[model samples]
Target: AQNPNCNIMIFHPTKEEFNDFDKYIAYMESQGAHRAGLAKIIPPKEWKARETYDNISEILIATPLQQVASGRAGVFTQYHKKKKAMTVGEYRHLANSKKYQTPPHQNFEDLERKYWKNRIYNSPIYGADISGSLFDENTKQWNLGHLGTIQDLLEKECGVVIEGVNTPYLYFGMWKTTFAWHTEDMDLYSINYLHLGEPKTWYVVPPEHGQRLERLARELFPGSSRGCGAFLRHKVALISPTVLKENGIPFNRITQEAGEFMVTFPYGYHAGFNHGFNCAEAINFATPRWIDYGKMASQCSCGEARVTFSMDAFVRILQPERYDLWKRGQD
Candidate 1:
């Protein structure tokens, strides 16, 4: 992980005791390991009649990372209004399609201004891709410029390796859905950065030195994953404004405004919940490892085709090509 400013942030549940997840965890670890795209269901370490799992559901694995973007009222208010109207699906397409492209002659601040020009999800008018520039071609836009700095600071500040840089990736998740318990492979240290809205993450974490938020919500309170369903389940943490101030983490909130934050995950293993009445927007850079590209082809035809809990499947429905796009990013 990097220093305070550069380190990747990850949020764990309020507590670390899973009354039913123990046995299943032992089984999975014993069987070699759980690779991505595998059709498998694991029982909770502390399972009970209260926590029931059904088929067609997923226990995706990604690090439990959380970061709150602390900002003033006016900025967050505009951010939330625009984001709420544009769900993950809308923003995914908008950002991918080249609309709202950033301006070439601007810095991050200018780009931010252009980004919030209107209360819409449209991409700003950035300049054309310039590989010759100091940054990657895809990130020629001003808004994306900070990614480089963020990556560098992550390594220097945090002790972990940040994977999936310069790779073609996709962000997928439901508009407002939830995910259940899961963990990830070794090649990645996840970066979960919250860039908008008032959201709090509820983590069901393993016992260790970190603070484990109690699993007060009965069946994996908000589900186990977050994101646009790209590679995560309930893509994005949930938080209620009333409880956000209580967390020891330092943050500021505003009504009708949006906030930004980032969380990190080296290995994905934990449950996540997005705790807020408002919509959420987040970005996660995951290093896809040992995934089965073959499975996606017939995923929809299988009737009960197993898919991650977030927006991946939905993305395919809107733009089937995204499946291949994400698969290629991992390679």
Candidate 2:
């Protein structure tokens, strides 16, 4: 059912390779993994994330309903905004409720119409920060909180506290619940792990087409802010695949299953929807290469989304080490 043309290959990392997590990511990127905007990592069969998950009943979540009377299959068209102090438990109950199973009167599903449609669901949790709460320093194996990449530099080196960027955020999604097209804040790399549940279908536009996509959006959404480099940061629009194909934008689609990880490169515009009920955790991380990307973001004055932490602080701390490396090279 998932027909994709763009080259977003799946990497099944060997035990030795996976052990060297940071190195493996660099290797993959060097081999052109970033060209696809997203890469799927399948760890060795023996590897496990965490034995259990937090209840997260106290944590609040956004419940946005996807209205389906608007379009056909695989189209992320329109949604009703609903901001509530909705807890995970309440969300679960609502998802499983009998009334929710049937499509609402206003949003009728055309069954037996020869074309397939993603089921319309009413409460989808988009983003909820869970670092200090659900996923603290305690989690092990692919823990977003404790990665070998820029997490340490941002946390210990720069000593900045930017929750949900360096820290982990939880997402609870049901069928047709979508995150609109957007890049990671500050153009940093982001990794998401499906704690447990159903698969999610992701649509990604590579870093190369980032500007082109923005142009298309500007053409489509005319009234959006002009001249800002991080235009997608607003998460304003969710364009359909048909429209993307019409514009000839290079894109890729993939289904991320449970226990697998999806890593997005810097400036890679991605938006996706859940196949069904699923819970996932994600956090942004940066390699040394991200310093330049962050600088580009700062130069653009990406409106609305603040730089989670100062990349200047990160570079200042690295000056001595950079000098030492340069001196060694000269010798």
Candidate 3:
């Protein structure tokens, strides 16, 4: 969580181009993706207030949370519905069982395997925290050199200097996670770049230019007031391209692999990520570059040690610049 800014920017890949970063930017521009809400004020480099994000720019990356919690919506829902879902004992069990793994450290399946073991259990048996060099596609060995290449590109091409301090928010976007709706509760762009899977998505209300919509809905329709974007495709099923257009959701679906997209918030809502058709692997980062937008907190009012809920956390995160002195007031 950080400060708020004038506007936000988001870019995604195009259907005609598969795994081509260049085409992705072209498609993003053609779709008026950035223009839909805010226009470029100045290159982020020239921004006078860039200092706030000195060490870390706020960011978020993940497959939709729904994928992980396919059966239950969130930690709360699961706990309430099933009774004590993530207790220390339960989490220890999951940790021990090796159900999931953390990312960026994700080294293909082998890395994922290590991640699951480490995540569920407190066991250091998995080895070291994932470094960039572990995912060398060419050598098939974890190579920090490749990781440096990625970091360099983000800094030079994307104007993002990743010191590993504010290394983007990482999420596994391969599976479909389901849960209730809420805002990003922070001032960061949630990015989804397809690495190895074909994921489907539906973004209904984007946080950028959504205040008017929210006011309008609440003023006119009381019961019909829609929470942030609702995940229209919450099921953990393989998503197809046709379903995207048919549902009015914009995305590019690849046959050989999964594609990716980015979702900005504060006003945006009703978007959901779909599962991959075949085997897939993807990298997503939620860097909070635009700290001028909001703050970060645990899923609900609860601090860490709780199962994080995206919607709840998002809605709760606020622009620190706006509510600087009011800590306990907004939660």
Candidate 4:
């Protein structure tokens, strides 16, 4: 289907298929390979479950990525207060190295006091320029068998430079570590690859229906109708799937498994919960289709202010090729 409203699509390939990573990695870095939609793929290299993924703990303990405050209430934004940022080592030590227990058995306040105290899970613990001293010179090719990251694709195709945007953040979450209803930065697409631990469930609304849902939200919670500045100041409303359904909105749910990828398209209003303790790698990117939406989101009030797409830079670099195609009437 050419429909952008569709949900997650899974790809299962045999171990022998695309076995020579070198043969397929090039196409994987191109826009034509993924511009159609988001998908979950089972790569040729099978992801066998491990007791603990290699060096995750060591990376956390040793790496020096930017750590952000996290907790249960942070999802609600309105009621949740941001916790203090600390090292991954400090977080694990405070959490007593226990996995985040699920609901009914999980106590948010107790969890905060015992495990989450002054800790951080939303950290940019890996990816380019991060943990740099550990790698030899010119080791950018190393990504632990992961395919081309967003930054790799952008730089490969357009010669555009991206820093934080290209970096994949390491999300370590426990029960109730919720990401509120929000689209990816600048309405660009996102690819999340779960490396280990329990599954995470996502509630997703396609981009076409995003504005209608936003209108419904404003109608229901008039307080949220304030200008974009105020809306971004705190956590936006956390609307549940049931609530959206009651208001006549449709959505899709996916329980993402480890070794699988969850790709969210432009402007999809998606939110999810990490069932228990988990680690996942995520990064954002844009294709030609993303320009209008990306520009729109760049001007919108929601999300982080620092998130911006270099549309101007893109045009500057693309003008020559576009002009050449136009001269040849290639379109």
Number of the top TM-score candidate:
2
Task: List the RMSD of every prediction in angstroms.
Answer: 19.8, 8.6, 14.6, 9.4
Instruction: Rank the models by lDDT, top first.
Output: 2, 4, 3, 1
Give lDDT for model 1: 0.27
Candidate-wise lDDT, in order:
0.27, 0.64, 0.29, 0.50
Candidate 3 least-lDDT 10 residues: 72-81
* Candidate 1 per-residue C-alpha lDDT over 140-194 given as tens digits, one digit per residue, 9 for 90 to 100: 2222223332233334443434432332122223122223333332212232323
Models ranked on TM-score: 2, 4, 3, 1
**Candidate 2 local lDDT, 167-250, one digit each (tens):** 566777665566778887667899998877767778899887788887888777655546454456656467766678989888
How do all models score by TM-score?
0.26, 0.73, 0.35, 0.62
The candidate with the higher TM-score, 2 or 3, is 2
Query: Which 10 residues in a row give candidate 4 its minimum summed lDDT?
Result: 124-133
Q: Candidate 1 versus the native: TM-score?
A: 0.26
Off by over 4 Å in 4: 1-5, 14-38, 45-54, 58-100, 103-165, 229-235, 301-304, 308-331
Report the lDDT tens digits of candidate 4 across residue range 216-321.
6666556556645224323345565556777887677667877676767777777765655566766666555566664455233343233324433333344433
What ranges in model 3 sit over 4 Å off?
1-31, 35-164, 168-176, 179-185, 206-209, 212-257, 263-266, 276-331
Evaluated at residue 236, the lDDT of candidate 3 is 16
Q: Which stretches of candidate 1 lie over 4 Å from their true place?
A: 1-176, 184-187, 204-260, 277-331
